[PDB]
Amino acid sequence: STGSATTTPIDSLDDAYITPVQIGTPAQTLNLDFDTGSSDLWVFSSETTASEVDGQTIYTPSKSTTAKLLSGATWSISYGDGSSSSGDVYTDTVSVGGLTVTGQAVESAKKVSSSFTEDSTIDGLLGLAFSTLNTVSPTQQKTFFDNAKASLDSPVFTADLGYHAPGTYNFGFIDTTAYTGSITYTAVSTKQGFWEWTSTGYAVGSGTFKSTSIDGIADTGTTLLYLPATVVSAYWAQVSGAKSSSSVGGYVFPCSATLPSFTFGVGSARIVIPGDYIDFGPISTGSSSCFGGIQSSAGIGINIFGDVALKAAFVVFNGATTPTLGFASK
Numbered sequence: 001s002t003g004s005a006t007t008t009p010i011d012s013l014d015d016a017y018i019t020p021v022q023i024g025t026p027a028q029t030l031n032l033d034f035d036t037g038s039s040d041l042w043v044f045s046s047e048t049t050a051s052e053v054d055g056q057t058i059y060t061p062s063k064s065t066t067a068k069l070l071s072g073a074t075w076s077i078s079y080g081d082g083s084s085s086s087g088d089v090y091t092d093t094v095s096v097g098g099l100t101v102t103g104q105a106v107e108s109a110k111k112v113s114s115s116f117t118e119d120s121t122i123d124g125l126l127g128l129a130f131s132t133l134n135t136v137s138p139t140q141q142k143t144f145f146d147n148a149k150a151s152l153d154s155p156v157f158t159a160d161l162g163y164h165a166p167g168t169y170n171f172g173f174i175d176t177t178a179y180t181g182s183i184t185y186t187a188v189s190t191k192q193g194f195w196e197w198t199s200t201g202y203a204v205g206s207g208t209f210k211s212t213s214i215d216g217i218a219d220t221g222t223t224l225l226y227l228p229a230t231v232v233s234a235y236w237a238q239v240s241g242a243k244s245s246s247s248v249g250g251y252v253f254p255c256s257a258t259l260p261s262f263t264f265g266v267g268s269a270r271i272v273i274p275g276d277y278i279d280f281g282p283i284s285t286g287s288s289s290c291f292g293g294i295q296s297s298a299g300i301g302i303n304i305f306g307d308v309a310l311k312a313a314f315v316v317f318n319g320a321t322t323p324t325l326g327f328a329s330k
């Protein structure tokens with residue numbers, strides 16, 4: 001089997017991407033944030049505290065003839081950005097882009113934090129990291145990808161995120177028309193439950209490539225590119241008037257600037273992030289200070305190849321017995 005679904009930016013900055021997901025019988029279509037940095041499929045629901053719902057589409061398990069309460073199971077998650085959600089669990093039929101899993105754990109939110117309530121465009125998350133990070137207790141549950149894997153033509157999914165445009169998530173096949181050149185594969189460590197890999201180095205604009213190992217995660221659920229302070233300082237030193245602002249919470253730059261590109265290494269290959277991809281716009285409406293798309297990871301404890309990096313590539317998440325990542329230009 002295979003599936004193929006279009007992913008759409010939630011706003012004009014590509015702050016996140018939503019992909020329609022069919023849940024239940026008859027189908028209830030919710031727009032989920034596909035997140036390769038977490039392992040829970042959770043939804044706004046008929047159980048969510050009413051004051052915490054503001055425009056999201058909800059899953060109502062009582063209207064699905066295939067929903068079953070997973071007796072005793074609860075979940076509770078806290079993300080890197082400080083947001084959180086918790087609730088109970090149903091099993092139900094879940095389809096993505098024509099690919100169907102029966103008996104998927106659908107985590108129903110009883111509570112969500114303010115950042116979720118305040119984002120009317122995201123109806124929940126669909127986690128695509130390794131199932132070892134799933135929060136369900138007392139019986140940990142499998143991701144949608146882990147449940148689908150055995151039925152797929154090939155045990156893979158691909159992320160093809162657009163810059164200010166729709167893209168695609170494919171399951172079970174590699175669309176050889178979606179990228180240029182060849183795919184370079186690189187080793188993955190699953191020891192922290194993430195798609196964790198080591199970049200071979202970087203370049204700023206037309207500068208010389210610096211060969212240096214940068215361990216980090218491929219995370220579709222993180223907006224920005226978080227890298228060591230040495231690397232980030234080197235990038236923003238090329239932008240007149242850029243500075244790290246403690247008050248704003250990262251590097252800012254004059255909105256009048258033209259930003260340089262940023263290149264990262266995948267083995268002997270190179271992925272170039274155009275400068276425009278690094279512009280996240282005014283810090284506040286009408287400001288001439290703009291927020292940077294490359295930020296320090298110093299305060300995180302891990303480097304994160306988030307959407308700024310991934311949307312410059314066609315990315316293969318290879319879930320073979322020994323997982324690997326693949327990157328191609330496009």
Ligand SMILES: NC(=O)NC1CCCCC1
Binds near residue numbers: 077079080133221
């Ligand atoms: N994706 C995140 O922001 N945090 C993850 C940490 C590991 C457990 C699942 C959530």
